């Protein structure tokens, strides 16, 4: 009955919003978003405003990716969403934000 998506001990959490600005009120995640940027980003670490690295060839209902722990290679336009699923590097949750429609 429960849906589950996993890569090893990392849980994959798909979250869908009609408007990305809704995430401004979503703690804790809001503190990692830079709401001025264009195109979906992932975080190399859990510093504030860390979601800045451009995901390669994203679905255009993808809004962004937040790994909740540990660090990973930080580069624009190299890692697709599928490869990022293999890049938790010890993070226990990979949050994938999707735009509804």
């Amino acid at each position: 009955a429960p849906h589950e998506e996993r890569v090893g001990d990392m849980r994959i959490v798909n979250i869908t919003f009609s408007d990305i600005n809704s995430i401004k009120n979503f703690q804790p995640f809001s503190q990692y978003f830079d709401f001025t940027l264009t195109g979906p980003r992932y975080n190399g670490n859990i510093a504030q405003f860390a979601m800045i690295w451009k995901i390669k060839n994203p679905p255009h209902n993808l809004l962004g990716v937040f790994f909740d722990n540990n660090t990973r290679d930080d580069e624009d336009d190299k890692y697709t969403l599928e490869e990022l699923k293999q890049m938790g590097n010890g993070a226990k949750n990979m949050y994938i934000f999707w735009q509804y429609e």
């Binding site: 589950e4 959490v13 798909n14 979250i15 408007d19 809704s22 009120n25 804790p28 995640f29 949050y95």
Partner: protein
């Protein structure tokens, strides 16, 4: 820190939730509000615990007993099943049992009910369950949304009068309009305290 509470969120997954009068669907508008509430409650105090239950579908179903693992909680909200009609009294009985068994009895107890569908119960019937919750130190928050059940706000507010103790329980009525459901609730004690 400050307030320390275990909350059970009772979400409406009835057939009425397919309706697009709340854009894009009542179900999606509830999902965003529930997601925001879990983040706000878990980040309010690291010892708060949040659980989630569905009220309709193929029966009342606990998705998680109360936990502080935000990722585990949010993971429950993907792939919701939809159908039937809510079982409000059963869902309340189940949530209260989950709250009773909390490991850290220092926590206050709170049920949040998302009432997006018509309420079939009787007003007297709802008052007794309210009085029971109050006796057991269980607070209640009611989110009344959806579309033509005229007695619904009256019934829900009678539930509230019966459970309320020291301003700990609240009701929010929110029709569809320019603001999303979550945005209306952000201003109310459902989110502020």
């Amino acid at each position: 820190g400050m307030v320390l509470e275990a909350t059970m969120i009772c979400i409406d997954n009835s057939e009425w939730m397919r309706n697009g009068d709340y854009s894009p669907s009542r179900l999606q508008a509830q999902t965003e509000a529930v997601n925001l509430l879990c983040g706000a409650k878990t980040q309010s105090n690291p010892e708060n615990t949040v659980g989630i239950l569905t009220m309709a579908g193929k029966g009342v179903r606990v998705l998680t007993t109360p936990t502080s693992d935000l990722g585990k909680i949010l993971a429950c909200m993907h792939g919701l099943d939809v159908g039937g009609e809510i079982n409000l009294t059963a869902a309340i009985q189940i949530a209260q049992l989950a709250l009773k068994h909390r490991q850290n009895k220092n926590q206050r107890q709170r049920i949040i009910v998302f009432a997006g569908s018509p309420i079939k119960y009787e007003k007297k019937a709802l008052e007794i369950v309210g009085k029971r919750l109050k006796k057991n130190s269980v607070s209640l928050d009611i989110v009344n949304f959806g579309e033509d059940d005229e007695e619904k706000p009256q019934k829900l507010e009678a539930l509230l009068t019966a459970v309320n103790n020291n301003d700990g329980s609240h009701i929010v009525h929110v029709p569809s309009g320019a603001n999303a459901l979550s945005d209306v609730l952000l201003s109310t004690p459902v989110f502020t305290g």
